RNA sequence: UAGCGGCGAGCGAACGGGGAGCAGCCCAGAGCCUGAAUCAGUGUGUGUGUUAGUGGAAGCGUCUGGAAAGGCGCGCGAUACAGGGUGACAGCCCCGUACACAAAAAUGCACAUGCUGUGAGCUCGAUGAGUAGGGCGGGACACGUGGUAUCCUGUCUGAAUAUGGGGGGACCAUCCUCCAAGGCUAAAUACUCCUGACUGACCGAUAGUGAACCAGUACCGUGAGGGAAAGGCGAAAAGAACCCCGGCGAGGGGAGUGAAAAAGAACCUGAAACCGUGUACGUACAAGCAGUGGGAGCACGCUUAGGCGUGUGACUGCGUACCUUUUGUAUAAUGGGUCAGCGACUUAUAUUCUGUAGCAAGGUUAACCGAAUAGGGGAGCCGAAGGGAAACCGAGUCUUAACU
């Protein structure tokens, strides 16, 4: 017979209150921070981590387009030479060798371009 | 305690072998009654299906 | 033999169990998950007795006279068990246990039902060829 | 057959007690759950009435005066009084059917083998208002502080047990499993009395 | 249910049945006998209650702690372990407690008595006139004049008188039942300013009484009237001698009290908003819901590197709060400054499905009784038969003259 709230009430607050960033003025101090930001921290959390996976691959091409072409056949052509094969295949990401082995890259170039028939 | 809406009672009070209480028939009965012949016989009553569910409250012990 | 490794473990009560499932729509309030708001929620009939659109109209058409057989329901005397807890003097007032006419009446005429006599100096005024054909292993009569 | 060696006693004996059902739960856990709500005559829940010291009618003026839209005052949001849906006395009482009553009761014979379904004396020699030495006869069996209850059927002067909860009489045709099961080993005893259809104790 | 009802809304019986309780008597009058039962007011007595009360059991030790009722060891009372209180929770410390006693007096009710009044009992009699009916107007009967019986009547009339008179729902006959105009009568129902005892799946200082506190106070109003805020040091005041700064201030710092003063009187626990001091990092050429994704550096921390943890975050992709209300929904439609506590499908009886349990062509009792959750009680409710508007018939029955 006792809804007696005070009970998780504070527990409640409490635990969004928890926004250790703190933000900014209201957006830790004031409850009225939660549903309307910790709740937006959620949101754009919920997409950029799966919207991100793109975010890098724009990134490991556009090292890729800067890295092959400078040694000829362009990032368009470069796929392509690579495309050829029974076995060779090995995707990107691993396609930085441009920054520590630039040998095997450049070595790895040929394997493209005189690989475009 | 619930109270059977005594109306109905009067109405379709009934229960054959198995619930389905027939209510009755007849239409113009005692108002116009002076047109057609064939297609007016009392013949008995009848119950429903669609409409059963809420002609069905009333009734609880067996009365009459 | 008790062992002093300190609990016993007999079989007293403590309790017995229980009776079936359905003790609690969840009521006694709505408070809690949910949420709920009941007056079911519209904005209609709110407290009960609000039987909103009286069952009569619109269901009360047409009312057949009608009026009262004064007979007081004249109880068929019984299931064909006439003679046996009959009093076994095959006649028929009142005082029975397994089928009895109930007394406050008029007159009875018994119907065939059950299962009939052995012995039965039938009477209670009454009739049927149910009766007259399956008491008739014993004792005729009706009188008046 | 057999209620398990009977200490002090020749043995115990071979009652009907009820056909010996096994339990069912769901029954007997009504009548339980049934059975704490019985002698409610009654029940409190006093404060009420939406309608505290309602001393007046709605006196702050509707349109204007800026954020306002109050009324009345018994109003179940201010703080100064007014508890909404009320609350009230009620009966609780459910009323459990009578054959489900008798339903599943004394399990305990057969589960409770090893525990209880005992049936001696009602301790006839007892002094006239003595429960000291209880122990004598608290120890023919060895349950004691255990809980138990007696069921001799007689309202002598064995109604001498009193204790902040260990042993209780009630040895009478009226006791419900409630008790029975509350106990660690109900001390049938009362001898004969345990018949077939009235095992009642 | 019957019935009443703009036959609207709604109003709503009784006969009859099951129980609690259970008794009938006076005057309408004389005589015989003759103060006789019956009551009432009063003085008295006895029972049994009310008003003070009396007796009422059985524990030591050691441990922790300021304090023992608590831990652990053993021991005793129990017709008493309801409860309260005592320096933390006690059957055995105190009040009580079951049980067992008790009243000069004063009264409640009972019985009994005396006094006063009453008047029993037998015989033979008498038997409630402006009344019953009724015309007009109304009210009461579940009944709204309805065909409306019956009851009371404002107003005006007005009889028979027991081989007579009323009633039996218009009214008449028959039959049945009962005597009106005079009166008395034991055996329940309602409420709470207050009384004592007791109880609570009732609140615990924004609650619960407006009021836990010198509250109907302070306040406010010409007034009637309205109407607050406000609890807690500690076990013990042991409430801080004395010393020092200071205005012989405030305030503080020591010392001492204390288990604690990180209990100092603002005194339990002391959160949040809000306000500061300190330290690590970012930061004075850079535009926007201030984050999120990436991310170097720096301060510490890492490890027998191993590429990490915490803080901070330059630079950079993105990118207009929540609510409400809206077609508008990022919407510039609604709701919400934030936090904490409270805040909305319950409850009663009835009816019907589903699951589950009991029993089975049978199932089940209600009130009530009660050696109270038993057992008893089967009044009654439902089902095993239906058809017809019904009488009526009945595994049939209606329909029709029909047997189809
Ligand atoms: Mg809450
Ligand atoms: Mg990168
Ligand atoms: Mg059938
Ligand atoms: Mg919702
Ligand atoms: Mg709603
Ligand atoms: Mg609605
Ligand atoms: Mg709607
Ligand atoms: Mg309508
Ligand atoms: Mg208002
Ligand atoms: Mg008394
Ligand atoms: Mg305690
Ligand atoms: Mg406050
Ligand atoms: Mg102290
Ligand atoms: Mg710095
Ligand atoms: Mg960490
Ligand atoms: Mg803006
Ligand atoms: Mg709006
Ligand atoms: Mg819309
Ligand atoms: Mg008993
Ligand atoms: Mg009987």
Request: proline fraction near 0%.
């Given at each position: 017979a006792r809804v007696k709230r005070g009970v998780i009430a504070r527990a409640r607050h409490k635990k969004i209150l928890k926004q250790a960033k703190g933000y900014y003025g209201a957006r830790?101090?004031?409850?009225?921070?939660?549903?309307?930001?910790?709740?937006?921290?959620?949101?754009?959390?919920?997409?950029?981590?799966?919207?991100?996976?793109?975010?890098?691959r724009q990134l490991w091409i556009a090292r890729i387009n800067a890295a092959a072409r400078q040694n000829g056949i362009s990032y368009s052509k470069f796929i392509n030479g690579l495309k050829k094969a029974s076995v060779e295949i090995d995707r990107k990401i691993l396609a930085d060798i441009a920054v520590f082995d630039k040998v095997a890259f450049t070595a790895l170039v040929e394997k493209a371009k005189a690989a475009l028939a | 305690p619930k109270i059977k809406t005594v109306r109905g009672?009067?109405?379709?009070?009934?229960?054959?072998?198995?619930?389905?209480?027939?209510?009755?028939?007849?239409?113009?009965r005692h108002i116009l009654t002076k047109k057609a012949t064939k297609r007016k016989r009392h013949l008995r009553p009848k119950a429903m299906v669609s409409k059963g569910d809420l002609g069905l409250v009333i009734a609880c012990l067996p009365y009459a | 033999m008790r062992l002093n490794t300190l609990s016993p473990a007999e079989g007293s009560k403590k309790a017995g169990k229980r009776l079936g499932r359905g003790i609690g729509s969840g009521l006694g309030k709505t408070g809690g998950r949910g949420h709920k708001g009941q007056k079911s929620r519209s904005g209609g009939g709110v407290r009960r007795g609000f039987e909103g659109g009286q069952m009569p109209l619109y269901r009360r058409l047409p009312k057949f006279g009608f009026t009262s057989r004064?007979?007081?329901?004249?109880?068929?005397?019984?299931?064909?068990?006439?003679?046996?807890?009959?009093?076994?003097?095959?006649?028929?007032?009142?005082l029975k246990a397994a089928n009895i006419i109930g007394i406050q009446i008029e007159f009875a005429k018994v119907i065939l039902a059950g299962e009939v006599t052995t012995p039965v100096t039938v009477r209670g005024l009454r009739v049927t060829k149910g009766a007259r054909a399956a008491i008739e292993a014993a004792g005729g009569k009706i009188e008046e | 057959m057999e209620?398990?060696?009977?200490?002090?006693?020749?043995?115990?004996?071979?009652?009907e007690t009820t056909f010996g059902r096994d339990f069912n739960e769901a029954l007997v856990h009504q009548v339980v759950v049934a059975y704490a709500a019985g002698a409610r005559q009654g029940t409190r829940a006093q404060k009420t009435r939406a309608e505290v010291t309602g001393s007046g009618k709605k006196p702050w003026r509707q349109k204007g005066t800026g954020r306002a839209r109050s009324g009345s005052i018994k109003s179940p949001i201010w703080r100064s009084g007014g508890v909404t849906f009320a609350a009230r006395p009620q009966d609780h009482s459910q009323k459990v059917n009578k054959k489900m009553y008798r339903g599943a009761l004394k399990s305990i014979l057969s589960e409770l083998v090893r525990q209880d379904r005992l049936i001696v004396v009602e301790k006839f020699s007892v002094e006239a208002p003595k429960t000291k030495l209880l122990a004598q006869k608290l120890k023919d069996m060895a349950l004691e502080d255990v809980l138990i209850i007696t069921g001799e059927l007689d309202e002598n002067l064995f109604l001498a047990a009193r204790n902040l909860h260990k042993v209780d009489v009630r040895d009478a045709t009226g006791i419900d499993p409630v008790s029975l099961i509350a106990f660690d080993k109900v001390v049938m005893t009362a001898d004969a009395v345990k018949q077939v259809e009235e095992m009642l104790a």
């Open positions: 830790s101090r004031v409850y009225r921070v939660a549903f309307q930001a910790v709740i937006k921290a959620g949101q754009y959390a919920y997409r950029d981590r799966r919207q991100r996976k793109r975010q890098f | 009672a009067a109405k379709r009070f009934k229960k054959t072998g198995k619930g389905g209480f027939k209510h009755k028939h007849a239409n113009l | 004064k007979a007081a329901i004249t109880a068929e005397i019984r299931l064909s068990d006439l003679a046996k807890v009959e009093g076994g003097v095959v006649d028929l007032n009142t | 209620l398990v060696l009977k200490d002090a006693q020749s043995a115990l004996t071979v009652s």
